[PDB]
Amino acid sequence: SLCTRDYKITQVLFPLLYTVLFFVGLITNGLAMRIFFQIRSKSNFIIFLKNTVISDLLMILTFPFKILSDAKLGTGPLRTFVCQVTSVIFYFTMYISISFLGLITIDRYQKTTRPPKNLLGAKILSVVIWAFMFLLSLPNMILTNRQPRDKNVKKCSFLKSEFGLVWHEIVNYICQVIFWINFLIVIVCYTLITKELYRSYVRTADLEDNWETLNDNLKVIEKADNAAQVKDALTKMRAAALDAQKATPPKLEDKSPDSPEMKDFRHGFDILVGQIDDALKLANEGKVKEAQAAAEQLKTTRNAYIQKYLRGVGKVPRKKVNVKVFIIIAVFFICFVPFHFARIPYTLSQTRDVFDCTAENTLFYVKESTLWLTSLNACLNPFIYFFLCKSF
Ligand SMILES: CSc1nc(N)c2ncn([C@@H]3O[C@H](COP(=O)(O)OP(=O)(O)O)[C@@H](O)[C@H]3O)c2n1
Ligand SMILES: CC(C)CCC[C@@H](C)[C@H]1CC[C@H]2[C@@H]3CC=C4C[C@@H](O)CC[C@]4(C)[C@H]3CC[C@]12C
C-alpha cells in the first residue's frame, strides 16, 4: 500500500526491448511457419518442432498487450487483461516450449544411438503437453477477479483472490519441477553425446597413431644402411597396418560387414600390408637397397592415395558433433536458468506481505529482466531448424 515502485525506467526500457523482440520474432517465426508447415510430419522431431513454432508464435502475440500496458505508469483495463489473460498465455506456452525442447533432445539423442504408431504416440503426447499447461493456466485466469484499489499499483498479486494466490504458488512450484526435470534431461543427453564424441576422438587418435608409426618407420628405412634396421622398421609398419585394419572407425560403425565402404577399407590395408610383406621378404634375404626400394613403393601416387583415403575414413564425422543438442543446452543456460533462479523469492513476495518495499521492488526488477531473456527463446527456437540443407 505505502510501498511505491519506480516504473520510469521500466516504461522506457521494457516496451523498447519487447518491441524489438516482437518484430524480430514475427519475421523469424513467420519465415518458419511458411517453411516447416509445408514439409510433411514423417518424424516425431518435426511433430515436436511444429508444436514449438506455434507455441513461439502464441507467446510473441502476447508482447503487444505487455508493451502497451508496461508503457503506462499506472494500472488500467489493459494491465488487468495482461494480468488475467495474455501474461498467463505467455507462461503456459513458455512451459510448452521447455517440454518440447526436452522431447526434441530425447529424440535427437535416440537418433545418435539408432543403427506409424510412434507418430500417433508423439501426437497424443503433444496434445497432453498442451492440455496439461492449459489445465494449470485456467484457474490463474479465473481467480484474477479483484479490481485494483490503488491506480498506481500494477502488481497482478493485488488482483487475485485468496485461492488465486494459493493456486499461483502451486503453479509456480509445478513449473519449477517442469523446468528442472527438462533441464536435467537436456544435461544428461548432452553429457552422453559429449562422452560419445570424446570416445570417437580417441578411436580416431589411436588409428592415426598407427599411421604415424608406419610413416616414422618408413623414414628409418630411407636413412638405413643395413638389413637389421630395415627388417625392424618393416615389422613395426606391418604391425601398425594390421592393427589399423582391425579397427571400426566412427564412419564405418553403422555399415554392413559386406558393404563396399567396409570392403574398400579392409582391401586398402591388404594392398599396403602386401607391399610391406614384399619388402620384408627382401630384408630377410639381406638385400637392403631392394628392401628399401620396395618399402619406398608406399610413396607411389597409388599407395599415397590409398593411405589418404584410409586415413580420411578414420576421421571423426559430423554425426558425432550434435549442434541441435548444444543449441538447446545453450538456450536453457541463457534463456531459462536465470528466470527460474529469480522466480521462487519473487513468488514468495507475491503470495505473502513478508518483504520490505525495496526488497520486493528489487525482486520484481530481476524477474522482469530475466523474463525478457526467457522471451528470446521464442525468437531463437526456429534456429534449431534454420541450419540444415532444406533452408540452404
Ligand atoms: C501454467 S500457467 C502459469 N505458470 C506460471 N509459472 C505462472 N506464473 C505466474 N503466472 C500467472 O500469470 C499472471 C502474471 O503473474 P506475474 O508475472 O507473477 O505477475 P506480475 O509480476 O505482477 O506482472 C498471473 O495471473 C499469474 O498467476 C503463471 N501462470
Ligand atoms: C487452448 C489451447 C489448449 C489450444 C491448444 C491447441 C492445440 C490443440 C494445438 C497447438 C499445436 C498443435 C500441433 C501442431 C503440429 C502438429 C504436427 C502434425 O503432424 C499433426 C498435428 C500436430 C500435433 C498439432 C495438433 C494440435 C496442437 C497440439
Short mmCIF file of C-alpha atoms and ligand atoms in Angstrom, two decimals:
data_model
loop_
_atom_site.label_atom_id
_atom_site.label_comp_id
_atom_site.label_asym_id
_atom_site.label_seq_id
_atom_site.Cartn_x
_atom_site.Cartn_y
_atom_site.Cartn_z
CA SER A 1 0.00 0.00 0.00
CA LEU A 2 2.51 2.68 1.29
CA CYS A 3 5.14 1.00 -0.95
CA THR A 4 5.94 2.71 -4.29
CA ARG A 5 7.57 1.02 -7.32
CA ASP A 6 9.62 3.09 -9.81
CA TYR A 7 8.23 2.31 -13.32
CA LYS A 8 10.05 5.24 -15.10
CA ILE A 9 12.96 3.06 -16.36
CA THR A 10 10.58 0.03 -16.78
CA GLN A 11 8.15 2.02 -19.09
CA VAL A 12 11.02 3.03 -21.47
CA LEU A 13 13.42 0.02 -21.30
CA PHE A 14 10.98 -2.98 -21.37
CA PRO A 15 8.43 -1.74 -24.06
CA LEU A 16 11.50 -0.77 -26.24
CA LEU A 17 13.14 -4.22 -25.58
CA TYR A 18 9.87 -6.13 -26.25
CA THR A 19 9.01 -4.10 -29.45
CA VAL A 20 12.39 -5.22 -30.97
CA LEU A 21 11.62 -8.86 -29.92
CA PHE A 22 8.04 -8.62 -31.35
CA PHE A 23 9.15 -7.59 -34.89
CA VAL A 24 12.30 -9.85 -34.79
CA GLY A 25 10.01 -12.68 -33.52
CA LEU A 26 7.23 -12.13 -36.14
CA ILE A 27 9.69 -12.25 -39.09
CA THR A 28 11.63 -15.26 -37.63
CA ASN A 29 8.52 -17.42 -36.87
CA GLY A 30 6.70 -16.13 -39.98
CA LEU A 31 9.57 -17.42 -42.17
CA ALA A 32 9.49 -20.67 -40.07
CA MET A 33 5.73 -21.42 -40.28
CA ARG A 34 5.58 -20.82 -44.07
CA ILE A 35 8.54 -23.27 -44.46
CA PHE A 36 8.10 -26.01 -41.73
CA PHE A 37 4.28 -26.38 -42.20
CA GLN A 38 4.86 -27.07 -45.95
CA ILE A 39 7.03 -30.16 -45.11
CA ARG A 40 5.25 -33.41 -44.02
CA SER A 41 5.22 -34.83 -40.44
CA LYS A 42 7.05 -38.12 -41.16
CA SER A 43 9.07 -38.00 -37.86
CA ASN A 44 8.47 -37.23 -34.13
CA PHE A 45 11.13 -34.44 -34.32
CA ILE A 46 9.18 -32.45 -36.97
CA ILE A 47 5.90 -33.00 -34.97
CA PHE A 48 7.70 -31.61 -31.83
CA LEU A 49 9.31 -28.85 -33.97
CA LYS A 50 5.87 -27.83 -35.42
CA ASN A 51 4.40 -27.58 -31.87
CA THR A 52 7.43 -25.43 -30.86
CA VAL A 53 6.93 -22.93 -33.78
CA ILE A 54 3.22 -22.25 -32.89
CA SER A 55 3.94 -22.05 -29.07
CA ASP A 56 6.63 -19.45 -30.01
CA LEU A 57 4.08 -17.52 -32.08
CA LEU A 58 1.46 -17.61 -29.30
CA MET A 59 3.92 -16.06 -26.81
CA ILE A 60 5.12 -13.43 -29.40
CA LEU A 61 1.44 -12.32 -29.93
CA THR A 62 1.31 -11.76 -26.10
CA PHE A 63 4.03 -8.99 -26.32
CA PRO A 64 1.90 -6.05 -27.81
CA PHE A 65 -0.51 -6.26 -24.80
CA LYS A 66 2.55 -6.25 -22.49
CA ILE A 67 4.38 -3.41 -24.44
CA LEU A 68 1.38 -1.00 -24.22
CA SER A 69 0.39 -1.90 -20.59
CA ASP A 70 4.02 -1.57 -19.36
CA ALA A 71 4.25 1.75 -21.34
CA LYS A 72 1.64 3.20 -18.90
CA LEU A 73 2.93 4.13 -15.40
CA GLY A 74 -0.41 3.34 -13.66
CA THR A 75 -2.96 0.47 -13.92
CA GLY A 76 -5.96 0.18 -16.30
CA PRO A 77 -8.25 -2.27 -18.19
CA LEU A 78 -5.34 -3.45 -20.45
CA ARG A 79 -2.97 -4.07 -17.47
CA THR A 80 -5.83 -6.07 -15.81
CA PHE A 81 -6.25 -8.03 -19.12
CA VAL A 82 -2.44 -8.77 -19.23
CA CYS A 83 -2.55 -9.96 -15.55
CA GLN A 84 -5.64 -12.12 -16.15
CA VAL A 85 -5.15 -13.47 -19.71
CA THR A 86 -2.18 -12.60 -22.06
CA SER A 87 0.64 -12.89 -19.46
CA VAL A 88 -0.93 -16.23 -18.30
CA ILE A 89 -0.82 -17.39 -22.02
CA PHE A 90 2.88 -16.32 -22.14
CA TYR A 91 3.79 -18.54 -19.16
CA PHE A 92 1.75 -21.64 -20.18
CA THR A 93 3.21 -21.51 -23.79
CA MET A 94 6.73 -20.96 -22.27
CA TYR A 95 6.47 -24.29 -20.38
CA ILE A 96 5.01 -25.86 -23.58
CA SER A 97 8.31 -24.81 -25.34
CA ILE A 98 10.51 -26.17 -22.46
CA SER A 99 8.58 -29.52 -22.63
CA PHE A 100 9.10 -29.89 -26.42
CA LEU A 101 12.79 -28.86 -26.11
CA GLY A 102 13.19 -31.67 -23.58
CA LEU A 103 11.37 -34.01 -26.03
CA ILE A 104 13.44 -32.86 -29.12
CA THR A 105 16.62 -33.57 -27.04
CA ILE A 106 15.43 -37.17 -26.13
CA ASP A 107 14.51 -37.68 -29.85
CA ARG A 108 17.85 -36.32 -31.15
CA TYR A 109 19.80 -38.35 -28.52
CA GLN A 110 17.94 -41.59 -29.51
CA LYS A 111 18.81 -40.86 -33.20
CA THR A 112 22.58 -40.95 -32.29
CA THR A 113 22.23 -44.45 -30.67
CA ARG A 114 19.96 -45.72 -33.56
CA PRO A 115 21.78 -48.12 -36.01
CA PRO A 116 3.29 -45.32 -37.80
CA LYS A 117 2.03 -45.75 -34.19
CA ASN A 118 5.08 -43.77 -32.85
CA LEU A 119 3.76 -40.70 -34.79
CA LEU A 120 0.41 -41.31 -33.04
CA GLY A 121 2.29 -41.62 -29.72
CA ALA A 122 4.15 -38.34 -30.47
CA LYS A 123 0.81 -36.67 -31.47
CA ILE A 124 -1.07 -37.80 -28.29
CA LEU A 125 1.98 -36.71 -26.20
CA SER A 126 1.93 -33.29 -27.95
CA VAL A 127 -1.85 -32.89 -27.15
CA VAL A 128 -1.27 -33.99 -23.47
CA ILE A 129 1.50 -31.31 -23.02
CA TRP A 130 -0.79 -28.50 -24.38
CA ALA A 131 -3.93 -29.70 -22.43
CA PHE A 132 -1.94 -30.07 -19.16
CA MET A 133 -0.46 -26.50 -19.33
CA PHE A 134 -3.97 -25.21 -20.17
CA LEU A 135 -5.37 -27.14 -17.11
CA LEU A 136 -2.87 -25.32 -14.79
CA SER A 137 -3.32 -21.91 -16.54
CA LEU A 138 -7.17 -21.73 -16.45
CA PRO A 139 -7.67 -21.18 -12.60
CA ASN A 140 -4.99 -18.37 -12.78
CA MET A 141 -7.21 -16.55 -15.36
CA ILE A 142 -10.45 -17.10 -13.36
CA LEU A 143 -9.07 -16.27 -9.87
CA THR A 144 -7.63 -12.83 -11.02
CA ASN A 145 -11.12 -11.37 -10.27
CA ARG A 146 -10.31 -8.43 -7.92
CA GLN A 147 -10.33 -4.79 -9.16
CA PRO A 148 -7.25 -2.53 -8.47
CA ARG A 149 -7.93 -0.41 -5.30
CA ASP A 150 -4.88 1.93 -5.92
CA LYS A 151 -4.41 3.09 -9.55
CA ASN A 152 -0.60 3.37 -9.11
CA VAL A 153 -0.27 -0.36 -8.09
CA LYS A 154 0.21 -2.54 -11.24
CA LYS A 155 1.13 -5.88 -9.49
CA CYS A 156 -1.06 -8.88 -10.54
CA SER A 157 -0.98 -10.29 -6.96
CA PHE A 158 -3.32 -7.44 -5.83
CA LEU A 159 -5.89 -8.51 -8.49
CA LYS A 160 -6.10 -12.05 -7.03
CA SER A 161 -8.49 -13.80 -4.65
CA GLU A 162 -7.25 -15.88 -1.60
CA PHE A 163 -7.34 -19.20 -3.58
CA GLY A 164 -5.91 -17.28 -6.59
CA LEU A 165 -2.77 -16.55 -4.53
CA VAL A 166 -2.69 -20.25 -3.39
CA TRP A 167 -3.03 -21.64 -6.96
CA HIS A 168 -0.38 -19.06 -8.17
CA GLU A 169 2.08 -20.55 -5.62
CA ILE A 170 1.17 -24.19 -6.62
CA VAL A 171 1.51 -23.45 -10.40
CA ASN A 172 4.91 -21.70 -9.91
CA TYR A 173 6.09 -24.80 -7.92
CA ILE A 174 4.93 -27.32 -10.60
CA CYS A 175 6.62 -25.15 -13.31
CA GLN A 176 9.91 -25.17 -11.27
CA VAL A 177 9.69 -29.05 -11.31
CA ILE A 178 8.86 -29.00 -15.13
CA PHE A 179 11.91 -26.74 -15.70
CA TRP A 180 14.45 -28.76 -13.62
CA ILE A 181 13.28 -32.20 -14.92
CA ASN A 182 13.65 -30.93 -18.55
CA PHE A 183 16.97 -29.15 -17.73
CA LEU A 184 18.21 -32.47 -16.20
CA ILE A 185 17.08 -34.41 -19.32
CA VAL A 186 18.98 -31.89 -21.56
CA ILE A 187 22.12 -32.06 -19.27
CA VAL A 188 22.09 -35.94 -19.29
CA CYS A 189 21.52 -36.20 -23.11
CA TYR A 190 24.29 -33.58 -23.79
CA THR A 191 26.78 -35.38 -21.43
CA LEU A 192 26.05 -38.75 -23.17
CA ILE A 193 26.53 -37.25 -26.70
CA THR A 194 29.73 -35.42 -25.47
CA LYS A 195 31.09 -38.72 -23.96
CA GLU A 196 30.40 -40.38 -27.38
CA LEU A 197 32.29 -37.54 -29.17
CA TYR A 198 35.32 -37.97 -26.83
CA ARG A 199 35.14 -41.78 -27.36
CA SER A 200 35.05 -41.28 -31.20
CA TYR A 201 38.06 -38.91 -30.89
CA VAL A 202 40.27 -41.48 -29.01
CA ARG A 203 39.37 -44.23 -31.56
CA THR A 204 40.48 -41.81 -34.37
CA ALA A 205 43.66 -40.71 -32.48
CA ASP A 206 44.54 -44.44 -31.77
CA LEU A 207 44.13 -45.16 -35.52
CA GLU A 208 46.14 -42.04 -36.50
CA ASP A 209 48.94 -43.15 -34.05
CA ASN A 210 49.21 -46.32 -36.22
CA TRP A 211 49.69 -44.16 -39.35
CA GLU A 212 52.38 -42.06 -37.55
CA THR A 213 54.17 -45.35 -36.53
CA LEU A 214 54.07 -46.58 -40.16
CA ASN A 215 55.26 -43.24 -41.65
CA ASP A 216 58.01 -42.77 -38.97
CA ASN A 217 59.42 -46.28 -39.64
CA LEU A 218 59.39 -45.58 -43.40
CA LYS A 219 61.79 -42.61 -42.72
CA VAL A 220 64.08 -45.03 -40.75
CA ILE A 221 64.23 -47.40 -43.83
CA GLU A 222 65.22 -44.46 -46.13
CA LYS A 223 68.07 -43.36 -43.81
CA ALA A 224 69.18 -47.04 -43.10
CA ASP A 225 72.33 -48.87 -44.38
CA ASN A 226 71.70 -52.44 -43.00
CA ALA A 227 69.05 -55.24 -43.30
CA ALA A 228 68.61 -55.48 -39.46
CA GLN A 229 67.32 -51.84 -39.23
CA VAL A 230 65.14 -52.24 -42.37
CA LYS A 231 63.60 -55.57 -41.01
CA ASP A 232 62.89 -53.88 -37.59
CA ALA A 233 61.05 -50.85 -39.14
CA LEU A 234 59.17 -53.07 -41.68
CA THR A 235 57.95 -55.35 -38.80
CA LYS A 236 56.59 -52.29 -36.83
CA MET A 237 54.92 -50.99 -40.05
CA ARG A 238 53.21 -54.39 -40.69
CA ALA A 239 52.01 -54.49 -37.02
CA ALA A 240 50.63 -50.87 -37.18
CA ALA A 241 48.90 -51.58 -40.58
CA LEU A 242 47.35 -54.93 -39.40
CA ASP A 243 46.24 -53.18 -36.16
CA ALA A 244 44.62 -50.31 -38.17
CA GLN A 245 42.93 -52.94 -40.49
CA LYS A 246 41.09 -54.41 -37.41
CA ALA A 247 39.57 -51.00 -36.40
CA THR A 248 35.93 -49.91 -36.77
CA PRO A 249 36.33 -46.11 -37.21
CA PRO A 250 33.23 -43.89 -36.48
CA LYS A 251 32.39 -43.61 -40.24
CA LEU A 252 32.12 -47.45 -40.53
CA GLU A 253 30.18 -48.05 -37.22
CA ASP A 254 26.68 -48.39 -38.79
CA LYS A 255 27.90 -50.05 -42.03
CA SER A 256 27.12 -53.65 -43.08
CA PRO A 257 30.14 -56.10 -42.99
CA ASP A 258 29.73 -56.81 -46.76
CA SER A 259 29.08 -53.10 -47.64
CA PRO A 260 31.54 -51.54 -50.22
CA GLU A 261 32.74 -48.96 -47.58
CA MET A 262 33.77 -51.79 -45.19
CA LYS A 263 35.27 -53.83 -48.10
CA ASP A 264 37.39 -50.92 -49.58
CA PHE A 265 38.71 -50.11 -46.07
CA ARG A 266 39.96 -53.71 -45.48
CA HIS A 267 41.27 -54.12 -49.10
CA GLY A 268 43.17 -50.81 -48.86
CA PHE A 269 45.16 -52.30 -45.96
CA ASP A 270 45.68 -55.60 -47.89
CA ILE A 271 47.43 -53.66 -50.70
CA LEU A 272 49.72 -51.76 -48.22
CA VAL A 273 50.46 -54.85 -45.99
CA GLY A 274 51.26 -56.73 -49.24
CA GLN A 275 53.86 -54.10 -50.21
CA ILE A 276 55.43 -54.22 -46.68
CA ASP A 277 55.48 -58.08 -46.96
CA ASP A 278 57.39 -57.91 -50.30
CA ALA A 279 59.98 -55.51 -48.76
CA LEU A 280 60.20 -57.67 -45.58
CA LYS A 281 60.90 -60.79 -47.75
CA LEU A 282 63.81 -58.88 -49.37
CA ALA A 283 65.12 -57.58 -45.99
CA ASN A 284 65.20 -61.24 -44.75
CA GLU A 285 67.38 -62.09 -47.84
CA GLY A 286 69.86 -59.33 -46.80
CA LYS A 287 69.06 -57.21 -49.94
CA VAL A 288 69.00 -53.77 -48.15
CA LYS A 289 68.65 -51.50 -51.29
CA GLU A 290 65.96 -53.81 -52.83
CA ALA A 291 64.03 -53.87 -49.48
CA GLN A 292 64.37 -50.03 -49.33
CA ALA A 293 63.14 -49.65 -52.96
CA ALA A 294 60.09 -51.94 -52.24
CA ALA A 295 59.28 -50.08 -48.96
CA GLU A 296 59.57 -46.77 -50.94
CA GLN A 297 56.71 -48.12 -53.18
CA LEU A 298 54.34 -46.90 -50.38
CA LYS A 299 55.21 -43.34 -51.55
CA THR A 300 53.84 -44.02 -55.12
CA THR A 301 50.81 -41.89 -56.17
CA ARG A 302 48.60 -45.06 -55.92
CA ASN A 303 49.78 -46.09 -52.41
CA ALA A 304 49.82 -42.45 -51.16
CA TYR A 305 46.18 -42.17 -52.45
CA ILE A 306 45.29 -45.47 -50.63
CA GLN A 307 46.79 -44.04 -47.36
CA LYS A 308 45.00 -40.60 -47.75
CA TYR A 309 41.67 -42.49 -48.41
CA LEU A 310 42.04 -44.90 -45.39
CA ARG A 311 43.10 -42.02 -43.08
CA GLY A 312 40.06 -40.00 -44.25
CA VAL A 313 37.72 -42.94 -43.46
CA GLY A 314 39.16 -42.90 -39.89
CA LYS A 315 38.29 -39.22 -39.24
CA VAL A 316 35.54 -38.09 -36.78
CA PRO A 317 32.36 -37.31 -38.82
CA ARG A 318 29.68 -34.53 -38.48
CA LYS A 319 27.22 -37.16 -36.96
CA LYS A 320 29.32 -37.11 -33.74
CA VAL A 321 29.01 -33.28 -33.36
CA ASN A 322 25.38 -32.56 -32.31
CA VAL A 323 24.75 -28.83 -32.85
CA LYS A 324 20.97 -29.18 -32.05
CA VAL A 325 21.54 -30.61 -28.52
CA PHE A 326 24.31 -27.99 -27.92
CA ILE A 327 21.92 -25.14 -29.01
CA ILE A 328 19.14 -26.47 -26.66
CA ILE A 329 21.62 -26.65 -23.69
CA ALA A 330 22.91 -23.12 -24.62
CA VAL A 331 19.21 -21.89 -24.70
CA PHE A 332 18.44 -23.41 -21.24
CA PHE A 333 21.50 -21.68 -19.66
CA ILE A 334 20.98 -18.27 -21.37
CA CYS A 335 17.15 -18.01 -21.51
CA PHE A 336 15.72 -20.26 -18.78
CA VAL A 337 18.25 -20.73 -15.91
CA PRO A 338 18.33 -17.02 -14.69
CA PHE A 339 14.49 -16.69 -14.62
CA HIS A 340 13.99 -19.94 -12.68
CA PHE A 341 16.66 -18.83 -10.12
CA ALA A 342 14.91 -15.40 -9.70
CA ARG A 343 11.34 -16.88 -9.54
CA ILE A 344 10.93 -18.57 -6.06
CA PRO A 345 11.98 -15.45 -3.95
CA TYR A 346 9.71 -13.29 -6.23
CA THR A 347 6.76 -15.76 -5.88
CA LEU A 348 7.29 -15.70 -2.04
CA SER A 349 6.98 -11.84 -2.10
CA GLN A 350 3.71 -12.01 -4.16
CA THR A 351 1.83 -14.60 -2.01
CA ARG A 352 2.71 -13.09 1.47
CA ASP A 353 3.37 -9.48 2.53
CA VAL A 354 6.76 -10.56 4.03
CA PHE A 355 9.36 -8.40 2.18
CA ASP A 356 10.34 -4.71 2.52
CA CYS A 357 9.29 -2.32 -0.31
CA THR A 358 12.85 -2.03 -1.78
CA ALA A 359 13.42 -5.81 -1.31
CA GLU A 360 10.10 -6.52 -3.17
CA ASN A 361 10.92 -3.98 -5.96
CA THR A 362 14.43 -5.48 -6.44
CA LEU A 363 12.84 -9.00 -6.77
CA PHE A 364 10.44 -7.52 -9.38
CA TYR A 365 13.20 -5.81 -11.49
CA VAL A 366 15.31 -9.04 -11.50
CA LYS A 367 12.31 -11.26 -12.52
CA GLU A 368 11.27 -8.67 -15.17
CA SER A 369 14.87 -8.62 -16.63
CA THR A 370 15.21 -12.47 -16.64
CA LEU A 371 11.64 -12.82 -18.12
CA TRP A 372 12.91 -10.85 -21.15
CA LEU A 373 15.77 -13.41 -21.63
CA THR A 374 13.08 -16.14 -21.48
CA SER A 375 11.27 -14.33 -24.42
CA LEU A 376 14.43 -14.59 -26.66
CA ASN A 377 13.73 -18.36 -26.90
CA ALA A 378 10.56 -17.58 -28.98
CA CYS A 379 12.90 -15.68 -31.42
CA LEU A 380 15.82 -18.22 -31.04
CA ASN A 381 13.96 -21.64 -31.25
CA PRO A 382 13.47 -21.61 -35.13
CA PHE A 383 17.36 -21.66 -35.48
CA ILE A 384 17.24 -25.39 -34.42
CA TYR A 385 15.77 -25.98 -37.96
CA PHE A 386 17.35 -22.94 -39.79
CA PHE A 387 20.82 -24.58 -40.01
CA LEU A 388 20.14 -27.54 -42.40
CA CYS A 389 20.15 -28.34 -46.21
CA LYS A 390 16.35 -27.62 -46.60
CA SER A 391 16.84 -23.85 -45.84
CA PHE A 392 20.34 -23.79 -47.58
C1 LIG B 1 0.79 -22.72 -16.07
S1 LIG B 1 0.26 -21.05 -16.34
C2 LIG B 1 1.34 -20.08 -15.34
N1 LIG B 1 2.58 -20.51 -14.99
C3 LIG B 1 3.36 -19.73 -14.21
N2 LIG B 1 4.55 -20.16 -13.79
C4 LIG B 1 2.92 -18.52 -13.79
N3 LIG B 1 3.45 -17.57 -13.02
C5 LIG B 1 2.61 -16.54 -13.00
N4 LIG B 1 1.52 -16.86 -13.71
C6 LIG B 1 0.27 -16.06 -13.89
O1 LIG B 1 0.41 -15.01 -14.91
C7 LIG B 1 -0.10 -13.76 -14.36
C8 LIG B 1 1.04 -12.72 -14.13
O2 LIG B 1 1.84 -13.11 -12.98
P1 LIG B 1 3.27 -12.48 -12.64
O3 LIG B 1 4.12 -12.39 -13.86
O4 LIG B 1 3.73 -13.26 -11.47
O5 LIG B 1 2.72 -11.01 -12.22
P2 LIG B 1 3.48 -9.61 -12.31
O6 LIG B 1 4.99 -9.85 -11.84
O7 LIG B 1 2.75 -8.76 -11.14
O8 LIG B 1 3.41 -8.92 -13.62
C9 LIG B 1 -0.83 -14.12 -13.06
O9 LIG B 1 -2.22 -14.39 -13.28
C10 LIG B 1 -0.14 -15.36 -12.60
O10 LIG B 1 -0.97 -16.20 -11.81
C11 LIG B 1 1.70 -18.09 -14.18
N5 LIG B 1 0.92 -18.86 -14.95
C1 LIG B 2 -6.45 -23.70 -25.73
C2 LIG B 2 -5.16 -24.45 -26.08
C3 LIG B 2 -5.01 -25.68 -25.16
C4 LIG B 2 -5.23 -24.82 -27.57
C5 LIG B 2 -4.14 -25.81 -27.97
C6 LIG B 2 -4.16 -26.09 -29.46
C7 LIG B 2 -3.53 -27.48 -29.70
C8 LIG B 2 -4.72 -28.45 -29.82
C9 LIG B 2 -2.59 -27.49 -30.95
C10 LIG B 2 -1.43 -26.44 -30.92
C11 LIG B 2 -0.23 -27.03 -31.69
C12 LIG B 2 -0.87 -28.17 -32.48
C13 LIG B 2 0.03 -29.20 -33.25
C14 LIG B 2 0.91 -28.55 -34.35
C15 LIG B 2 1.63 -29.60 -35.15
C16 LIG B 2 1.27 -30.91 -35.22
C17 LIG B 2 2.09 -31.84 -36.08
C18 LIG B 2 1.19 -32.52 -37.16
O1 LIG B 2 1.87 -33.63 -37.66
C19 LIG B 2 -0.08 -33.17 -36.54
C20 LIG B 2 -0.84 -32.24 -35.58
C21 LIG B 2 0.03 -31.50 -34.50
C22 LIG B 2 0.49 -32.50 -33.38
C23 LIG B 2 -0.85 -30.32 -33.93
C24 LIG B 2 -2.14 -30.77 -33.17
C25 LIG B 2 -2.86 -29.63 -32.41
C26 LIG B 2 -1.92 -28.81 -31.48
C27 LIG B 2 -1.33 -29.72 -30.32
#
